[PDB]
Design a binder for this molecule. Sequence first.
Ligand SMILES: O[C@@H]1[C@@H](O)[C@@H](O)OC[C@H]1O
Ligand SMILES: [Ca+2]
Length: 223
Amino acid sequence: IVGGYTCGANTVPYQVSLNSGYHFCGGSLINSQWVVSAAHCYKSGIQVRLGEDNINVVEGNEQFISASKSIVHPSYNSNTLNNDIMLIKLKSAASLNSRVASISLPTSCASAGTQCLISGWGNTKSSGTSYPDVLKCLKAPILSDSSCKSAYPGQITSNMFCAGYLEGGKDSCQGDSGGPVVCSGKLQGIVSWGSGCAQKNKPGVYTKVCNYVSWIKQTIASN
Ligand SMILES: O[C@@H]1[C@@H](O)[C@@H](O)OC[C@H]1O
Ligand SMILES: [Ca+2]
């Protein structure tokens, strides 16, 4: 997270860290045994880490559960990052309390101008490299379909929405991939891609989760 703040320990109780010996992506717990992430965050040997604040320190609220099954969306195009969504199932359910909680899926798509919360353990420098150990947060408005397509001509699909700041300085970044974009208590976006981080006229592009609620429900209902 570039240009954000320190969320606070377990102040985002649905955020997840995907560990393969090291934090490489984030996630969002949508129920006690399913995590939503980004398809480009796929790999074998994913251990899901819940209750995390400091990902290099065991503080005493973590839950380490290995994944049992990964499901990358049937239509995920790596080359355009269209349908950049995957489901991860936990080998055992999570113990749901105040610091490990699921996030509600959306019933309708969120609107441009709506203010969302973007969190992750990703890079904090737009021109540099520094990774945080504690969770970082950002509050960002969803940008209008027109300004999104103007910043990325020929790339933005109906399965993507831009959110952030066109003046540059505040964005999500490498390492926050697969993390939540929560608007009005719902999961509306997934950290997907973008040109650099926090650059002028190059905002963050996020997977439009409202377009995938039916897939998530019928996939969860059969696996
Ligand atoms: O984002 C672009 C994608 O849409 C495609 O064109 O492949 C190259 C990328 O720069
Ligand atoms: Ca920890």
